[PDB]
Every structure is written in structure tokens, then in C-alpha cells.
Amino acid sequence: DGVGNASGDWHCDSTWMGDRVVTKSTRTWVLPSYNNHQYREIKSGSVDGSNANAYFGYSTPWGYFDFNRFHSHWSPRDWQRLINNYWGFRPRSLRVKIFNIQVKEVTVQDSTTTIANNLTSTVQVFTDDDYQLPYVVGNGTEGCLPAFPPQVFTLPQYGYATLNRDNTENPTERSSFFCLEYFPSKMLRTGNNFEFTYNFEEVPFHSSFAPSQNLFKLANPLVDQYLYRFVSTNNTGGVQFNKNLAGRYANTYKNWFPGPMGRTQGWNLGSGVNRASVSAFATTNRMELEGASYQVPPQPNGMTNNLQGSNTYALENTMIFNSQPANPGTTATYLEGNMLITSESETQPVNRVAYNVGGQMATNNQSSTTAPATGTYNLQEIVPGSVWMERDVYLQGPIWAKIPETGAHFHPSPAMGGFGLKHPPPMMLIKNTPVPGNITSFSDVPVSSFITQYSTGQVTVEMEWELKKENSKRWNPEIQYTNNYNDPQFVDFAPDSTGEYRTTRPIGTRYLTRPL
Amino acid sequence: DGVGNASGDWHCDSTWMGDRVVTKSTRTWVLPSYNNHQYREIKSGSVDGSNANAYFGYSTPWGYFDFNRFHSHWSPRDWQRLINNYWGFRPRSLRVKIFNIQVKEVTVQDSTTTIANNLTSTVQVFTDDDYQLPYVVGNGTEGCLPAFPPQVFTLPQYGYATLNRDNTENPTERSSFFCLEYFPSKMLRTGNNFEFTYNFEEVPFHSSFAPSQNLFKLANPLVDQYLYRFVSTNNTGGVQFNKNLAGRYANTYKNWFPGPMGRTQGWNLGSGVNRASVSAFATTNRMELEGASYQVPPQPNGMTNNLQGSNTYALENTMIFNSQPANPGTTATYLEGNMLITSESETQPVNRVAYNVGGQMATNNQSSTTAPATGTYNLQEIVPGSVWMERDVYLQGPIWAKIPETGAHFHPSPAMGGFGLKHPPPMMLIKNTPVPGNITSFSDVPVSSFITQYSTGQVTVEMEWELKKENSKRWNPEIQYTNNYNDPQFVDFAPDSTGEYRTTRPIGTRYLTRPL
Amino acid sequence: DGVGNASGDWHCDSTWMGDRVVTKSTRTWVLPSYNNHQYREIKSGSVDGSNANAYFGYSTPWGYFDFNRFHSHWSPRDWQRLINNYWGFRPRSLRVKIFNIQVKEVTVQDSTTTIANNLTSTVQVFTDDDYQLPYVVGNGTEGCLPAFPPQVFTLPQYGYATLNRDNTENPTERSSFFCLEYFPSKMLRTGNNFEFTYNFEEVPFHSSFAPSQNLFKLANPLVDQYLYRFVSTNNTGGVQFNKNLAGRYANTYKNWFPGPMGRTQGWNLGSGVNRASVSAFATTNRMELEGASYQVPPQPNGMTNNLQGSNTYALENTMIFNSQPANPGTTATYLEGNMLITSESETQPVNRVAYNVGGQMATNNQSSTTAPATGTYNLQEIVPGSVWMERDVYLQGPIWAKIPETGAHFHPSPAMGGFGLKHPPPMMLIKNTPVPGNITSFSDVPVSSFITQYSTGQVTVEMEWELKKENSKRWNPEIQYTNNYNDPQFVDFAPDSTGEYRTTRPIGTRYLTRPL
């Protein structure tokens, strides 16, 4: 109500209630006045050698809230209690509240910055709940609610890239400009707040279980099939058959088949024997899209890398994360030790690997002059009767994504991971309202001389999750995530001497097992 | 409600109501923004020569309220009316209120500190009422509500020490990190307040009476016992007996026995004849605990020191206090005159002393070649039928303590003194919410450049105490605490020329007597 | 009702319902007619060199049901879901049913055993629910419901050892004989069953959490104590003091102390450097009890062995199990690899170790001719203010035990582990009723010529357990039990090529952590 009255409390709890959990999470944000309160037309040409990077777009003076990562809601213990006890989870509800807003005036006079504040400047927030803006949230960008609650993060500047012309920087006649002050906002002073609720649509549970049984080994090895296989041909042209025996799985008949595949290059981590002095951009997996050719990591769902205890990964197919956040616009060459290299190892009984071929088809029609030839294929798409296992979600990883507004789509699982929503959580845009300076005379040109200012405040996000409870009759103990460290020099998922929150390793979700 | 309206009054009264007393106490506090609003990993090795001092832990940017001393609630007169009229007291209720919060911005520009204030910055308070944090309150640390009401105290920085590995500074896999912004707080501006109530659980009354009768002298010295004692043996092997006479207490049969004991070293105060040039750390009483060996002062309840008018104390077994508060991290070598050396002299009819042996057992089996031998023991633990007298509480001393969350414990009286609570009064954590500076561009690294600020305000604590009234038929006058000073140069428990509140001597609670 | 009608179904399910779980478990048993249907007076002298082993007792023709092990109710997966999610469990109810009884006549004629059956022979069962018999169940003996449900176990023969005279085999006048046919039984034919219910009394939860914080390190390492310690003495006799600093835990004042202790010998497992050619029976920990001296493994609660990653254990203080069951009356010398050696490693922040001393007391009274001496003690019993951590329960370990019917006891936690019940689950005695042979004439001597026969059947036991749910705000992932094997040659807690259920390692219950 007033300036000397808090407009919201710090809620950062987490209440497990049966097959239901709410995870409140309050963080503190800073909004710099981006672009000095005006729109800019940003563009670029063929940088990094490729004309893929040429874009046309607009950068706004708006910041936005991007809590589309799992660590923004889950502590590493509450994540551990999730991934070791439940076979699924999905979001149900969402409740965001921006509160305790305070706006500061920085005045640089005589080499002395003076950060005062006014009780009069406003901050306008709106929520794009009709999806009329480019939804830039679910695309794996920075600027999120941090993993650690007393970290104060800055809000990322809202920009978007529209259509360009002929892979150049120049616009096209179909490229549109969206003014964000053409949306009804809510101008908030230092005693006002912004509540907002959201109910998720029915999405499937994230299948957070490892396969406890191979896909091609679903028959029992005791009784043998009543189906015969072609084995050979005699000295004449006549065919011969044998019974499909019990333990032999390389030749039984199968009901179900693995998912999609596209063969990627396999690179050795760890000890490693790799090719030396490699500039691997011209040999990676491209996917041309009306013009230029784009790298597409990670490749679509239905594959895996890192079989089991193998140092070979498919680095084109994995979700490499960093241990700490980095400076925006860095060119440092990181190594295997610095980065959190994701392994989808557990999904190998269902998914084919990415650094090998899937199988082989026929090449020629046989005759008594022509022996039958085969040939390995590097990519196989959807076949009727396929079954795959989607990409695992991680603590340091995205929660949802938006399906594009095209007419058609197939099986909307995001390739990076998470949930494919049709109407995702709306993008909370926020900016500082501009305050003019010392205008003494009238001029028809708009004001360019504003009071420089930022604004800070807190925000809370209350998620709600529906759990799929574990119902297994497995006898022996399962593998579960544990805090195993051979006398470390530091506690992990906890600060250090400086105060830097330190995450050493990624945390998956497939730890419990389940028979096919 | 608003900034120009006080959100709480100064209550510092004390209302004696029958067998019930409420002691309100308002103080004024200052909260420095510790660690510049971020967590730190603190650690240390084997300092002071001993690997006992090696710890691993975290220091928070939170301050806390620690009113766990008796002088924070009791004036020296209201304490005197307590200790001279009542045989017991225990806490019943508790009511804490933080009010009149105001937060100041210090700006050091051109060698000129300018302490302004904003009406917009918040302060978040929560109360750990589920005991999910390390309860660092009841362990005899500084930073309390002062003994004197117009003293303005600063809030102590909340830190805790978790498990370390192999007596080094390095962490272990079982050492946990608690983020305190993961608790639901209450962000308070300059017009808001924080009320909180608490009801104590049923604890025993503090037995605030001296024994008016010895424990081994509970028979009357007029009639003699109907029980005989072994006295000697004749020139043959035959045993002989005598009757237990009336006045003789060194050989009657006893029903009850003293409490626990561990023999400590006895050091002479006053005039004194002590060992010279002593480095007494290698000769003190250690108690090894999974690794290193810790000094444990004071040793557990059931002993005493300073018999009666003896300059010999057990300095390992007493509660030495200071006359005035000291600078944090001092290495001054204080003397007997500066310090308030506690004497548990009055509990000598029940408790054995600490600088002597308790008794003697048998050493050998006797025969007609072997005379019976004895041997003095230096420590005797709980025996069925024991009775002891717990440590006295003092005006300058702790009120409660928390029992640890292990499965088992025996007789939870804190060795330092006071009340052993299972669910103690919850620890009121409080910090300044961080205000960012002049962030002009987006970066994914968290904000490290905050506006430096502190916040002050008042706090009141209303205790409630249940009294055990004195019901004695003693004829002669009892000893009571009195203001006896042979024409002092200053009034005691009152300020001086500078304005320093001066306490010269400790004040016990056992002044009235009571027969066993 | 009839012989061609099953009198009970196979229930071996396990239903997790909130903070409550029922574990049904059906096994199949065989009852040999022990002693050929008559009582025997069994006795022994000082075998194995020690007169401790001399006993006097009686062996009955009764078998009994002994489901007092945790694997008899918990599959290794249902045990894993318990020990990784809950901070406690205790039994609430019990329901035993003996059903599908069938009794077989073996007839050895002309070197040809012919196992027929009659529909007429009975089997009598009763339940000792007034505790009038010696309760031989809770003492860690064989003959239990197996860990694996399709294992068919035989019922152990009920015997007991009464008082003997002067450590010989001869009886005493106070040694009593209990006839078990003097109890009202229930004679069951092949169409009858025996239902029985039992409600447990309120026992404490098993504290199934590791300490996440040391006992002597409960102060925070940031603020320092308001209590001073004796440090040394100057060149004169005068004492000197220092403040207890913050990080230093070897010299702060403590509120709580570890539990009981008796120093045992420490033997190195693993790589190991041990004494060679050892006959360690004359150097172990004995406890003399009215006559002879008994080994007492494991020593009472409040200690530990195996600090952390140390090959040294206290083999006198641990619960060594076997991988497979063994033949009754074996003398094989097993090794470290064959046996399941229990480690109580996680209870080291609270419990002192068993292969070291606990601390040191004072030895002499100091003076200026006598320096202060100390001395390490090997055993310390209950001290007021103690806190310990009881022995962990295991999957291959006992559930309950009976407190003896003496007048007094202290803290009835069984030293082997589990629950100390005053009225334990009653001992289900069962025997074959005797069937006489071909008696053709009258004689006053009783019949010694019976039809040799055994009887088999199924039994189910339905336990009910109350769970103490995990409520922690820990951030980082906890250590949990997992199925970790570096490509084993066999699945563990599962059969092998022969069909032998193979357990390789013991499973504890303290996996989650909890602050003190």
C-alpha cells in the first residue's frame, strides 16, 4: 500500500504432499534500462564463416523473467528425493509474483556515481498470455532464476529475430515488428505488486525410469518360438528353415523396433584416442532450412550416446553444460574437465546409439548369378511399431518449450528435453518506464535525454507437480543418486571460500528401473 | 502502516503477579550486511596446536537474535527479588517482536561517508520453528541483548560448522549446506513489524535452594541404627561386628549416593600457592570424540568446586565470566581480578568436589597371606540411587539449550546451566535484502556490486516465568543476596563516568535453604 | 473344511500406504518329528576349554516359528525403498497363519523309503502369549523364514537351557522343567488352519539416519563463546585464562557427551597388518556372570567401529554374517571374503570408537612440586547428559528381542540390534502328534514305538510398520543405497545357476542424513 510497507514475503519452501509437490522459489532481480528506453533494429551477416548466423531482428528495452530451468525450483536435495522415488512428474500449476519493487537513480557527477532512489518512478509489467509475441523463453538461453537462492540475477534483455532476406541481414516484406508498449501493461510503483496464475495443460509424465530389460530381448530364454526363420539355401535353389531357439535373440521375430536415428560422430572423452587438430564444423550434422545449413544439436529423440562405461560419446548429440555461469560473449576454449557433459547412457536398451549404424537393408535382388548384398544405413526415421525413450531432463536443464504455430507437427517432444507445451507459461515482460530529463523547450522530435535508472526487487514462482509413484516388485536394491565423493576438497552443490555456488556434475532423472 | 508512524512501543517493564512473572525487555539492534550479501565457505585447520579446532562450515549474510542469557530479561533488582524468595522458576511463554525498522545507505564518496536512508529497502525475517537449521544459539556465544537497556547491540553473524573429514578442514560427503533463503521469510519495510509467540514445554523447575543438610548426615544423631557394620577380624579368621552408633556418620548405612564425578585439577585463587609457569592445556580434562580430543568445560553435573571459604577452585569446572564485553578476537591474558569466577560452593552437601577423589573400591581378594587393599578412583558415573544437584544459573548466564537430535540421551541438563529443551525457542534469523547498483548491461554471472547498507530497529522479548514459592518452617534468618560494599568508589550494576555498565560480581540463585 | 480344499492362499505381497506399510510373506515349512516324540534332558560340560559353555536344559519334540529377521518380511527392493526415504520405522501389528497342513508317513521297508500320507494324523499348534516358557526366539539363532520366498525351510527344534550348578552340567533345585503339552494347543488335521493376531506396544522408531553434524562441533565456527577456559599458569602459582574462539572445537564447552564405551581390540581387514598366529579368546572382552566369564559380542550400544574408509574394525563389536546358510555344527574357518562384516561407520559423529580410549581424567592433585598428570580410561558408562546412537538394523538381522523378567533394567535397546519389547510376539510352538504302532498287549510302560512321520505346510506372516517420513531442507543429494557392481558375474540378491539365493553384502538403514 505504502512505501514503508513490504508488499510480499520471502517464500522459498518446498512441500511434498503425497503424489503432489509445490516448490516455491523466491529470487532477487535487477533490471537495467536496456537500450536507453528505445527500440533498436539489430542485424548481422555471415559471421563465423557461415551464412546461417545472419539474422534480422529487434532488441527491446524490456527485460523478461525466464524461470525455464529445473534448478530454479528444485534444491539438489529435493531433486534427489524426486529422482529416486518417483517414475514420473509433470507440471500442473504455476504462480508468479513480482514484489518489493524499488527503482534507483544513478547520477554520475564529477566522477562520483550517486545511487539515490525516487518513490515516484514506475515499472510496467505485462504477461503475454495470448502468444502474440515471439516466445524466446524455451530455447536454452541464459538469464534465469539461479540455482542458489541468495544469488541476485539480472534480467535478460528481450530481443527476437524475425525473417531475413536471402540469408543476408536485410529484412523481408513478411518480417514483422512487435511493439511491446502496444500491449496493456501494469505500471507498478514501489508499493505495488504483480500476481499471476497459470494452469498447465495435460502433458504426459516424464518417463523417469531406466529400462530394466532390453527391447530385442523381451522373450523368455526358456521356451522357444513357434515361428521359423530363413537360414540358408541348399546346393540347388531351394530354401531351408530353422526354428527360433529360446536363448538366441539375434534371430527371433520382434514386435517392436527402436526409434529414429541419425548417425553422429563419436568422440572419445576421458583417456581418449581422438583425431588430432580438428576443426569439426564442416563434418558435423547439418540440416538445411530454406537457404543456409544449421547445426542441430541435440539430434531428435530416439537415440543415445555413451553405451556403458565407454569413454566414447556423441558430442553432437549430448547436452553439455558448464560448472559456473560465464561472461556474455566469451571465446574461451573449455575442456572435458570444466564442462558438465550429459550422458544418456541408461536409455540404451530402447534407443540405438548415435555413433553407429542402425542396421542394414537389402541392396540387390538375388539370383543364381548374384549373391545377396546388404548395406548399412546411417539414418532411419519413424517406422510403424517404433518405441523409443525421450531425452532425460536434468537439474541444470530446461523445463518446457513452445510448439511452433505451424499447421502440423509430429510427436512434440523437445529435442533439448522437457515438455512440449502448446500454450506455454506466458512470458513476463518488464521494463523501467522512461523518465525525461530537463526539457525546457518544445520540440517535435521525441525525447532522447532520460534520467538513467535501474530497478530491483524480488520475484517468487510457485510450481506444482503431479507425481507418478513407483510401483515395482523388484527384489534387489536399485541404483540411486548418492553424494559419493572420495574425501573432496569441497562440498558439492554448496558454496566455497569466495561464495561461488559450485555444481560439479549433472543430475539425471532415470535412476529407478522398470521392466518393458 | 506508514513511514511516519511508529510500529511499536518501548516495553521494558516487569510485572510480578503471584506465582507468575512477565519480564518485557526492549533493546535496539544494528544489522550490518555481513559477507556483502553472499554465502562463504569458512574452514580452518589445526590452529592453537590442536586438531580439535579444525572445522568446515558456512557463514551466512544473516544475523540472528540471541536473547539466551538471563540478564537480557532480568534487572539486577528483579533478579534479587527472585533469588531470595522463590525455590524455583521455569520459562512458560515467549513473545518476540521486531519493530521500528529503518534501513540506512552509507555512501563513501570523496573520503566522506554519507549515511542517508531509503524508505524502500526491505529486511526479511523468519523463525526456524521446525529446527531444520543448526541451532547455534544455546552454546554460550556473544551477541546477546545487553544487560543494560540503553546499550545498542549489533546482531551476530549466523554461521555454523558442519562435518569435516579426518580432522582436517576438508568437507565430507555427509556434510550438508543449508541455504537460508530456502526458508519462507517475511520482507519488512520501514512500516512493518514481526510478531512471534512461543509456548515452552514442561521442564522441571530450577532447584534454586541450598541444601540445609548433608547427604550422608540424614539420620538423627540421637537414636542409633538397627544395622551392624563389619569392623575387624580377630586373631583367627573370624569376623567381628559393631553397632552403628548415633552421632557417627562415617560408618552408618546410606540410602542415597552423590552424583557423577570426574576429577579435575584444583587451582588456588586469592592468596594462592600454585605451580609456577604453567601451560595447562596438556594436563586438562579431554574427551575424545571420533578423532581429536576436546576440552570439555564445565564437566558434567553432579560435582562442585570451592568447598567453603577455600581459595582452591576447579578452574576447569567453573563458569568464568568477564566484567565487561570484549573485542572479538582478543588474546589478552586476564587475571583473577578482572574475571567473574563462578563458585558452586553451596551444593557441597550433595555433590562431591572436583579436585579430590570420590572414594575407594577394593583392589584384591583377601586371604590369610593377603591384607585387603583399596584404591582411590578419579571418576564415578551414574549409580542407581544417586542424587546430585545441577549447576546454578546466573544473571550473566545462559537460559536454555537444545538437546541434539540423536536417538538417545540421558538426563538432559545442560552442563553450562539452565534448561534442556527438546524444541527450544526458534532462532530468529534476519538479514538485509540486497539492493543492486548500476547494472547497465546483461550478464549471466550474478550481481556482485550491491549498494552497501545496514539497518537498525528495536526488538522486544516478553518472557513468562512460573515460580515455585518458598514454603519453609525455618526459624533463624536465611542468607540472602545483598548490596554489601565497604564504601565503594562506584555503584555496582549501574554505569560510571564514561557510561559503561559495570558488573563486578556474579549472582547465583541458590540463596534460600531447604532440608533434604 | 475338507481334504480336497485349500485352507489358505499364497500371500507374499507388500503394500506401501502412506506412512504405513504391510509386508505379507508366505513360506513353506517342514516339521521333522524331533526326539521321536519325547522329552530329553540335554546337558554339557566345559567344552571348548571354557566352563562358560556348561549348561543344563531340555530338548522338546516341538518345533517353532522364528520369523525374527528382517529379510523374512522385506525383499531387497522393498528394503531399499525403506532405507532411502524414511527416517524411522517400527512394527505395529502382526498376523500369522499356518495353513495347508499335510502330514506324511515315511515307511522304510526292505531298503525302500515309501512316503505315503494319512488324512487322519493331526498337528497341534499353540502360541505362548503369557510368556510362561523360555522365549528362545530373540537371541540370534538359525531356523528362520528364508530371505527368498521359494526356499523351503525346516522348523528349528525347541530347546532351552535352565540353571546349572557350580558351572557344571548338573541341575540345581531352582532349575525348572516346562512341559509344553501342559499348554492348551489346537490339534489341526489336513483341512484346518491356525490364525493369530498381535498388536505391538509403543516402542521408539528406529533412528535410521546418519548424523550430518559432529557432536562436539555443534557451535557455529563464526561467533565465539562467552565462556572462558583455563589455559595455563604463570611463573608464579596464578592461573590464566583465554576466550573460547569460534572455529576451535577442541576446547569449547560442551552440553552433551557421547554414550557408553568399553575398549575392544581393533583388527585390520582388507589389506591389513595384523598380529600373526593369533588364538584370540584369552584376550577378548569377557563379562563374568555368577561363576564363569562370557564373551559378550557385540558390546553394548553407544560405540562404533570402522571410522571412515579404515580397514581397522572392532571384530569383537560388529555383527558378522554369512553369505549363505551353513550346516548345523560346522567348524570351518571362514575368511574376510566369505563373511558379511557389518560396519557401524556412519554413527561416528555421536559414538566413540571401540578400538581407542574415550578420553582422560585427572590422576593427581597438583601443587608446586607435582605437575598435573592424566590417564586414559578404557571404559566409561552412563553419564548424565549423554547421547548416543543405537546399533543399526540390517536386512539379515534380528527384528525384536525380549527384555528379561527381572525387576529392573536400564534403556532396553538390544545390543545385537532392533527393538526391545516387554511382551514380544508370542512363540508359535508346533509339533506332530504321536501315532502309536502295533501295540498288541497292555503294558504300564509308555509307548516308545511310534509311526515315524513328518508334516509340511505353508505359513504366512503379515507385519505392519509405521513410517517416520523424511522432512529435511538439505540442498545437495544424499548418499543412498544403490545396485553398484562393476560388471558382475552374477546378479546380487537373486539366484545363480544352481538356484542358490546369493547375498553378497549387508544392507544398513542409516543412509539419509539429519542435523543434530
Cβ contact (<8 Å) for C480 and A481?
A: yes
Residue of C460, C398, C322, C462 lying closest to C136 (CA atoms)? C398
The CA distance from B26 to B152, in Å, is 11
The CA distance from A455 to A31, in Å, is 5
Q: Is the dihedral of CA C255, C256, C261, C264 positive or negative?
A: negative
Contacts of A480 in chain C (CB under 8 A): 80, 84, 480-482
Q: Which DSSP letter does residue B346 get? A: G
Burial A454-485 (b: 16+ CB within 10 A, else e): bbbbbbbbbbbbbbbebebebbbbbbbbbbeb
Contacts of B172 in chain A (CB under 8 A): 487
Determine which of B122, B126, B450 to mutate to test the interface with A (most A C-beta atoms within 10 Å). Answer: B122
Task: Pick the residue from chain B with its C-alpha nearest to A63.
Answer: B442
Cβ contact (<8 Å) for B141 and C250?
A: no
Q: Which DSSP letter does residue A72 get? A: G
In angstroms, what CA-CA distances link A3 with A8, A75, A451, B174, B188?
12, 33, 21, 45, 11
Q: Is the dihedral of CA A214, A218, A219, A220 positive or negative?
A: positive
Task: Provide CB contacts within 8 A for B471, sequence distance 6+.
Answer: B87
Which residue has cell 559423529? Answer: C349
Q: Measured between CB atoms, does B469 come within 8 Å of chain C? A: no
Q: Contact, C162 vs C176, CB < 8 A?
A: yes
Q: Which helix (DSSP H) or strand (DSSP E) does residue C46 occupy?
A: none
Strand partners, C24: C462
| CATH number for C316 | 2.170.30.10
Cβ contact (<8 Å) for B262 and C362?
A: yes
Q: How many domains does chain B have?
A: 1
Mind spelling out the 3-state secondary structure of B213-233? CCCCCCCCCCCCCCCEEEEEE
Cis peptide before A156 (omega within 30 of 0): no
Task: Pick the residue from chain A with its C-alpha nearest to B62.
Answer: A150
Q: Contact, A143 vs A30, CB < 8 A?
A: no
**Strand ranges (DSSP E) for C192-311?**
194-199, 209-211, 228-233, 239-243, 261-262, 267-268, 286-288, 293-295, 303-304
3-class secondary-structure state, position A83: helix
Q: Measured between CB atoms, does A280 come within 8 Å of chain C? A: no
The CA distance from B142 to C225, in Å, is 6
Q: Measured between CB atoms, does A425 come within 8 Å of chain B? A: no
Task: Please tell me which chains touch C, using 3 or more CB pairs under 8 Å as the contact test.
Answer: A, B
Task: Provide CB contacts within 8 A for C340, sequence distance 6+.
Answer: C320, C321, C322, C323, C396, C503, C504, C505, C506
Q: Measured between CB atoms, does C21 come within 8 Å of chain A? A: no
Contacts of B298 in chain C (CB under 8 A): 253
Q: Measured between CB atoms, does A477 come within 8 Å of chain C? A: yes
Type of residue found at C154: T
Both ends of chain C: CA-CA distance in Å? Answer: 58
Residue of B360, B355, B349 lying closest to B299 (CA atoms)? B355
Type of residue found at B209: F
Nearest 5°: the CA angle C497, A347, A304 is 130
Burial class of residue C49, CB neighbours in 10 A (0-12, 13-18, 19+):
exposed
Task: Pick the residue from chain B with its C-alpha nearest to A482.
Answer: B173
**Strand ranges (DSSP E) for A141-221?**
152-154, 157-162, 186-188, 194-199, 209-211
Cβ contact (<8 Å) for C482 and A480?
A: yes
Q: Measured between CB atoms, does A84 come within 8 Å of chain C? A: yes
Residue of B44, B4, B10 lying closest to B24 (CA atoms)? B10
Distance from CA of B433 to the nearest CA of A (A): 8
- Phi, psi dihedral angles at C347 (to 5 degrees): -90, 10
3-class secondary-structure state, position A420: strand
Task: Provide CB contacts within 8 A for C142, sequence distance 6+.
Answer: C156, C325, C328
Contacts of C20 in chain A (CB under 8 A): none
Determine which of C87, C207, C217, C367 to mutate to test the interface with B (most B C-beta atoms within 10 Å). Answer: C217
Q: Which of residues 391-420 of C touch B (CB under 8 A)?
A: 408, 411, 413
The CA distance from C426 to C126, in Å, is 10
Q: Contact, B60 vs B36, CB < 8 A?
A: no
Residue of A262, A263, A255, A261 lying closest to A384 (CA atoms)? A255
Cβ contact (<8 Å) for C368 and B176?
A: no
Strand partners, A450: A436
Cβ contact (<8 Å) for C233 and B333?
A: no
3-class secondary-structure state, position A309: coil
Type of residue found at C82: L
3-class secondary-structure state, position A182: helix
Distance from CA of C508 to the nearest CA of B (A): 16
The CA distance from B175 to B58, in Å, is 11
Contacts of B37 in chain A (CB under 8 A): 150, 152
3-class secondary-structure state, position C143: coil
Q: Which helix (DSSP H) or strand (DSSP E) does residue B22 occupy?
A: strand B20-32
Task: Provide CB contacts within 8 A for C57, sequence distance 6+.
Answer: C41, C42, C43, C159, C160, C161, C162
Q: Contact, B416 vs B364, CB < 8 A?
A: no
Task: Pick the residue from chain B with its C-alpha nearest to A149.
Answer: B181
* Domain around A98: 1-516
> Which among A476, A484, A494 is the nearest to C483, CB-wise?
A476
Strand partners, A413: none
Q: Which three cell numbers stand for residue C145?
A: 523364514
Q: Contact, A259 vs A387, CB < 8 A?
A: yes
Q: Which three cell numbers stand for residue A236?
A: 540347388
Cβ contact (<8 Å) for C473 and A80?
A: no
Q: Measured between CB atoms, does A492 come within 8 Å of chain C? A: yes
The CA distance from C79 to C89, in Å, is 11
Distance from CA of C304 to the nearest CA of A (A): 20
Cβ contact (<8 Å) for A458 and B165?
A: no
Q: How many C-beta atoms lie closer than 10 Å to residue B384's C-beta? A: 7
Which residue has cell 535397546? Answer: C413
Furthest-apart CA pair in chain C: how many Å? 106
DSSP H helix total and E strand total for chain A: 1, 31
In angstroms, what CA-CA distances link B147 with A379, B324, B325?
80, 11, 11
Q: Which of residues 113-172 of B touch A (CB under 8 A)?
A: 116, 118-122, 124, 126, 162, 165-166, 170-172
Distance from CA of A78 to the nearest CA of C (A): 7
In angstroms, what CA-CA distances link C367 with B281, C113, C176?
16, 88, 61
Cβ contact (<8 Å) for B287 and C229?
A: no
Distance from CA of A6 to the nearest CA of B (A): 5
Task: Pick the residue from chain B with its C-alpha nearest to A37.
Answer: B440
Residue of B510, B432, B515, B431 lying closest to B472 (CA atoms)? B515
Cβ contact (<8 Å) for C483 and A492?
A: no
